[PDB]
Every structure is written in C-alpha cells, then in structure tokens.
Design an enzyme around this catalytic site. Structure first.
Site, PDB file in Angstrom:
ATOM      1  N   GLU B  63       1.035  -0.890  -0.120  1.00 19.58           N
ATOM      2  CA  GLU B  63      -0.074  -0.009   0.064  1.00 19.58           C
ATOM      3  C   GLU B  63       1.115   1.134   0.098  1.00 19.58           C
ATOM      4  O   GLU B  63       1.282   1.516  -1.081  1.00 19.58           O
ATOM      5  CB  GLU B  63      -1.241  -0.042   1.141  1.00 19.58           C
ATOM      6  CG  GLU B  63      -2.068   0.773   1.304  1.00 19.58           C
ATOM      7  CD  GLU B  63      -2.884   0.914   2.616  1.00 19.58           C
ATOM      8  OE1 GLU B  63      -3.025   0.130   3.012  1.00 19.58           O
ATOM      9  OE2 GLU B  63      -3.254   1.994   3.054  1.00 19.58           O
ATOM     10  N   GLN B  76      11.009  -8.355  15.591  1.00 18.00           N
ATOM     11  CA  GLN B  76      10.676  -9.613  16.568  1.00 18.00           C
ATOM     12  C   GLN B  76       9.487 -10.285  16.265  1.00 18.00           C
ATOM     13  O   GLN B  76       8.711 -10.034  15.300  1.00 18.00           O
ATOM     14  CB  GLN B  76      11.116  -9.424  17.989  1.00 18.00           C
ATOM     15  CG  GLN B  76      12.602  -8.815  18.237  1.00 18.00           C
ATOM     16  CD  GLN B  76      12.646  -8.612  19.830  1.00 18.00           C
ATOM     17  OE1 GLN B  76      11.914  -8.983  20.542  1.00 18.00           O
ATOM     18  NE2 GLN B  76      13.772  -7.758  19.978  1.00 18.00           N
ATOM     19  N   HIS B  82       3.478  -1.799   8.150  1.00 18.19           N
ATOM     20  CA  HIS B  82       2.713  -1.787   7.062  1.00 18.19           C
ATOM     21  C   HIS B  82       2.258  -0.168   6.875  1.00 18.19           C
ATOM     22  O   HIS B  82       2.919   0.468   7.742  1.00 18.19           O
ATOM     23  CB  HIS B  82       1.314  -2.396   7.134  1.00 18.19           C
ATOM     24  CG  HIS B  82       0.354  -2.423   6.139  1.00 18.19           C
ATOM     25  ND1 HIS B  82      -0.629  -2.052   5.754  1.00 18.19           N
ATOM     26  CD2 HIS B  82       0.363  -3.050   4.673  1.00 18.19           C
ATOM     27  CE1 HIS B  82      -1.358  -2.060   4.595  1.00 18.19           C
ATOM     28  NE2 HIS B  82      -0.578  -2.658   3.885  1.00 18.19           N
ATOM     29  N   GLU B  85      -1.439   4.457   2.093  1.00 23.67           N
ATOM     30  CA  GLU B  85      -1.320   4.756   0.781  1.00 23.67           C
ATOM     31  C   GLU B  85      -0.220   6.000   0.562  1.00 23.67           C
ATOM     32  O   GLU B  85      -0.736   6.975   0.896  1.00 23.67           O
ATOM     33  CB  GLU B  85      -2.665   4.834   0.015  1.00 23.67           C
ATOM     34  CG  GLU B  85      -2.403   4.109  -1.449  1.00 23.67           C
ATOM     35  CD  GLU B  85      -4.001   4.479  -2.183  1.00 23.67           C
ATOM     36  OE1 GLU B  85      -4.930   4.633  -1.689  1.00 23.67           O
ATOM     37  OE2 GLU B  85      -3.768   4.847  -3.426  1.00 23.67           O
ATOM     38  N   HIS B 118       8.833  -7.691  20.405  1.00 23.54           N
ATOM     39  CA  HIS B 118       7.864  -8.599  20.165  1.00 23.54           C
ATOM     40  C   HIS B 118       6.437  -8.048  20.011  1.00 23.54           C
ATOM     41  O   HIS B 118       6.134  -7.459  21.220  1.00 23.54           O
ATOM     42  CB  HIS B 118       7.680 -10.100  21.141  1.00 23.54           C
ATOM     43  CG  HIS B 118       9.201 -10.580  21.430  1.00 23.54           C
ATOM     44  ND1 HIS B 118       9.670 -11.602  20.560  1.00 23.54           N
ATOM     45  CD2 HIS B 118       9.875 -10.195  22.359  1.00 23.54           C
ATOM     46  CE1 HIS B 118      10.960 -11.761  21.126  1.00 23.54           C
ATOM     47  NE2 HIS B 118      11.045 -11.056  22.123  1.00 23.54           N
ATOM     48  N   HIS B 123       3.434   1.568  11.978  1.00 21.84           N
ATOM     49  CA  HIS B 123       2.657   1.765  10.925  1.00 21.84           C
ATOM     50  C   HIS B 123       3.078   3.192  10.096  1.00 21.84           C
ATOM     51  O   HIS B 123       2.907   3.972  10.924  1.00 21.84           O
ATOM     52  CB  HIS B 123       1.210   1.764  11.379  1.00 21.84           C
ATOM     53  CG  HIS B 123       0.420   1.446  10.149  1.00 21.84           C
ATOM     54  ND1 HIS B 123       0.128   2.558   9.146  1.00 21.84           N
ATOM     55  CD2 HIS B 123      -0.331   0.460   9.876  1.00 21.84           C
ATOM     56  CE1 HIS B 123      -0.735   1.898   8.195  1.00 21.84           C
ATOM     57  NE2 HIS B 123      -0.698   0.904   8.736  1.00 21.84           N
ATOM     58  N   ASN B 203      20.500  -9.975  18.701  1.00 21.41           N
ATOM     59  CA  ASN B 203      20.118 -10.591  17.347  1.00 21.41           C
ATOM     60  C   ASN B 203      21.017 -10.568  16.384  1.00 21.41           C
ATOM     61  O   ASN B 203      20.588 -11.276  15.217  1.00 21.41           O
ATOM     62  CB  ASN B 203      18.825  -9.378  17.072  1.00 21.41           C
ATOM     63  CG  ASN B 203      17.533  -9.726  18.036  1.00 21.41           C
ATOM     64  OD1 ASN B 203      16.654 -10.506  17.328  1.00 21.41           O
ATOM     65  ND2 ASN B 203      17.492  -9.418  19.359  1.00 21.41           N
TER      66      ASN B 203
HETATM   67 ZN   LIG Z   1      12.528 -11.141  23.648  1.00 23.26          ZN
HETATM   68 ZN   LIG Z   2      -1.975  -0.939   7.429  1.00 27.73          ZN
END
Ligand SMILES: [Zn+2]
Ligand SMILES: [Zn+2]
Ligand SMILES: [Zn+2]
Lengths: 214, 214, 214
Positions: B63, B76, B82, B85, B118, B123, B203
């Site tokens: 998008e 995580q 996301h 637009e 996590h 967004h 990580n």
């Molecule tokens: Zn952790």
């Molecule tokens: Zn979204």
C-alpha cells in the site's frame, strides 16, 4: 536444524470433533475473498465477497461458533477472531455467549465494510456493525460495536454496546455502559472520519490483486 | 481434517498489481539477514545486513511503499510493518503519508541498530531513528521517533515527533506534540538505558546462528 | 508472484549455535500436546501434557532458556514466549534474568492449568503460577504472577510480584511492588472468577480433538 520434516498442512481447515462439536465444519469462503497462505482459517466460518485476510491472521471457530465476516471487510495482519463456548453439554444454547444480528445467531459477527486493522482482536461474544474501523492493536470482547464507528488504535470495548457513529480515543478501555454512552461522535472534521472508507477501498483492491497471484 | 491440500507458497514475495502499483516489486534482502520461514515479507521492502526477522513477523509493502529496515536492526516475533497509501491515482505523491530521511522518501523507515520488540508495530507514515528500542506491544504511527530513544512496553507514539534520546513510560500513549516535547530523557541510570545495545548484539548473533541452519 | 519457491521447513526446531549456546537443544513435547502447524516452537522448550498451542503462537527459547509450559496449559493464537539472555560469556548465570520455581531455574516458567489468551505475551525473566488466566493482549515481563490470578485483557505486570489469588483490571499496567501489593482479590462473585477453569477444560479438549486430525 535437522529440519524435523517439512511441515505439510492446509491453512484453511475444519474444526476438530469435541464434546460441543459432534459434526465438524469447514469454512465457507467466497471465491472473490483472498486468504493469505500464512493466515489460518479454521472451522465454522463464513467469509464474504472481496474480503482480504492478511498474513498471520487467525480466524478460529472451534469453540464459540459461527464466526462471520461480511462483504468487503478486511482482517489485517496478526488479527485474531475467536469466541467463548456457545454450546453446552445437556443441550446447546449458552445464550450469554451468542450475539444476534438480523435474526441470526453468531459467536462473532463482523459486518460489511469493516476494517480489523493490524494486530487488533475481536473475541466473541461480539458484533461489529457495518463501516466501522477497528484500529491497530484495539480489542473488542463481549460487546456490540455499532455501525460507522471508529475504535482508534489501542482502544478497547469490553462488555458494552458502542452506539452508532461514535469513536473511542486511542488507548481508552471502555468497560461500562455509562462510559460507552458518553463517547464522542464521529463528525466530518474528526481525524479518523474518512479512514474506514479509504481502508476498505484499498483492501478490496488488494484482495483482487492478490487473487491474481494465486 | 481432510487437509484441503498442503498449502505451498513463498514467504518472501512481490506485492500485487493494484491501481497504485502498476509494477510489482520484490524485497531486496541482504544475504546476511535472516528471514524466519514463518515470517512474511512482501513487496517493496529493503532489509539491511545482519537483520533478524523472527517468526510471525509481517512486513508488508503493498500500500504505502517503500518499507526500509536498516543494518543490524531486528523485527521480532509478531511485529507488523505496513503503511498508508503513498500514491494517488492522478499522479503519485500523497505527501502527508510519506516520511523523508537523509533525502529519500519512505512509507516506513526503520534505521540502523533498531529493535522492534515482540508484537510491536510501526505503521507508516513513520520513521524510527538509529539505536532506538521499540518495546514489546508498543505502537508507532504517523510519527517520527528520534535516535537513541526507548518506547517501553505498551507505550505508543501517534502523530508526534519523539525527540532524540527520550523514553516513553510503559503504557503511555503520546498523541500530542506538547506531551512528546515533555518526555523524560534517557540517562545512564534509567532502567532501559542499556537495553537496545544488548538486544542488537544478541539479534545480530542470532541472525548469524540461524543463517547457519538454512 | 513468481512464488520464489515453496518455503519448506519444520515449525518445531532446535535453537541456533550462538556464543551463549554451544549446544543446540530441541523442544521436549509431550505426545498428548498439540502444536498447530502454524505455531512455531524453537529451542530449549518443555511442553507438558494436554497443552494446546494455537496458530501463530511463537515460543522461542534461543536467548534466555529454558522455557517451560506446564500440563494442561494453553498458549493461544499469536502468543509470544521469549526471554532475556540467561547466560554470559565468561561463565553462565545471569541470575537477574533467571527465575526459580520448585528448585529449578527457568528463563520462562508457565505453570500447570495456565491460560495464555490470544495475543498475550510472557517475556522472561518471568513465572506464572498454576491456574492463572493471562488475558487477551496482556503482558508479563520481569515478574512473578502467583497462582489463581487473573490478568484481565490488556493488563500488564512489569518488574513485580503478583500475590496469589489477585486480579489486574483490564488496561492497568502494574510497574511497582506497592501497586501489585494493593491489587484486588479474586472472589466467587468476580467476573473472571471462573474463567480459567472453563478455558482450561475447553483447551484440553481442543488439544485432543486437534490431535485426532493429525
Ligand atoms: Zn525477547
Ligand atoms: Zn496498514
Ligand atoms: Zn478465545
């Protein structure tokens, strides 16, 4: 490591036989809906036309049932739909866990043109009326959310009825009818007043584009 | 039940053709990043070196686009990226949904050495500056989080700019610039002052170890 | 698009070799537990009898270890279990990140008959005592939750000890021992007083029904 096997399976499946479910059911999914391969859809579920179900969503109708998702609605990434037991073991009806919408009973009812945004959850018994946005990380449980509503991100509705056309401010957890009654109204100038229609337009078009990749 | 099929698919895929995306794009992922098989990465995404993407994360650039994740950052389990637009249908630029960082435009920009812990979510439009920890279940949307920041667990930043070196107390939802301006500073003695560097070290090493299993 | 490949893999796997984990471990899962094909279970994990692990859950013991889940407990959809590093690089014991329960050390300890409801998370170091419900979207980190407790939806316990038989009101984030000490008690008339036993009964039966589908 050692890759135990290769984990073969279908992500769209029937629910298991249990004491409350003698007869297993498989999802009824409109040919125009798109179910991502990494979403899960189990049991007595109805999915409407042009719905997009994104990666990591889990729609599981194996306890409370049925779970319905209306036409042109979208179930975004990581969204869970599940519900409390709707049937007993002496007969059926556990009426307090069953929601009623247009003369039909559901464990979860998601209306038409509804957006369940990323990582939100709707746990039955619950109903969400048409054209409502359920924001990112929001939560609805034991509640009826009217039509044309907006649950901003991280809001929640638990054990209440949200009147039509209202919104719940980000972060606010509504647990009493008194407070649900006082929510603010969606007006033309409110920041999320046009959010749902945009999201639904987008997601119907993503469902079609993704269908053309399968 | 009946195992419909065996659900074959790739978890790293191009985005679909839509009205705002005439030309599909596939992720550009550094050979040293690790993408778990149960993560999803779709569309116009850039993933940097030594990044670890854990199970159930969903990075979807279909998008708003592009979505960038800098070197030595980690996404995580259950984290969603996301965005709104970024392009219209009369031309492109929907400037209010586009973030600008070092002279380049992004729908979501995740800098270097950033931990998305996590079940958090970022967004777009959004930017997260280097060396910042975005805590478990936290949320960033329509915001710019500076470098060396700490969003404690369940904090959120919506429509604001978080100055460099500040932290947001667990559970607090920041929705106004006035409040973002008043956040507390990260000091040597603050409880999460060393958390991000530890997590990034870990990580990067998990990404390498997991790469040696594929 | 182009379906890169078909993404073959096992969802139950050993953890990777790292500087803190010279010897990889594979999960020890009772034959009567059910692990959904779309759940992930990695590394030094113990799963008890009759446990149900739902779609999209991620139990990852690759940093802090071990992660234990007691008999007849359930790890619902999208639930994450993970933990801070429990071992150093000069020796082992990072004691502040290790929880102790019945004379044994764990990174995360989930007792018997415990419900981790949808999208909740328990991040080590942490312990959750028998017969406790951890509600939808709730969060436990650096904490010990006693037995017979109820974390309502969206509650959180961070750096505290929740005494036996107490509950945390929906949305409340408990970060100090003073506040944990003052939580309300579970009484027969409390709204979630019978919730956990119902959920455990249901989930043991779902685990068996789902086992009969594999
Ligand atoms: Zn952790
Ligand atoms: Zn979204
Ligand atoms: Zn449930």
């Amino acid at each position: 490591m050692q890759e135990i096997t290769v984990d073969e399976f279908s992500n769209i499946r029937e629910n298991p036989v249990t004491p409350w479910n003698p007869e297993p059911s498989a999802p009824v999914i409109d040919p125009t809906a798109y179910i991502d391969p990494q979403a899960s859809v189990i049991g007595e579920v109805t999915i409407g036309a042009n719905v997009m179900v994104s990666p990591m969503a889990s729609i599981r109708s194996d306890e409370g049932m049925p779970i319905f998702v209306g036409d042109r609605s979208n179930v975004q990434d990581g969204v869970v739909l599940h519900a409390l037991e709707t049937i007993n073991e002496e007969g059926e009806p556990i009426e307090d866990n069953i929601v009623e919408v247009d003369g039909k009973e559901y464990a979860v009812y998601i209306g038409n043109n509804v957006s369940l945004a990323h990582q939100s959850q709707v746990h039955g018994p619950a109903a969400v009326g048409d054209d409502t946005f359920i924001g990112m990380q929001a939560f609805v449980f034991k509640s009826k959310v009217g039509n044309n509503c907006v649950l901003e991100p991280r809001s929640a509705a638990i054990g209440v009825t949200i009147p039509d056309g209202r919104y719940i401010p980000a972060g606010m957890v509504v647990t009493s009818q008194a407070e649900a009654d006082k929510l603010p109204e969606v007006t033309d100038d409110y920041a999320y007043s046009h959010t749902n229609e945009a999201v639904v337009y987008v997601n119907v078009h993503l469902a079609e584009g993704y269908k053309e990749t399968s």
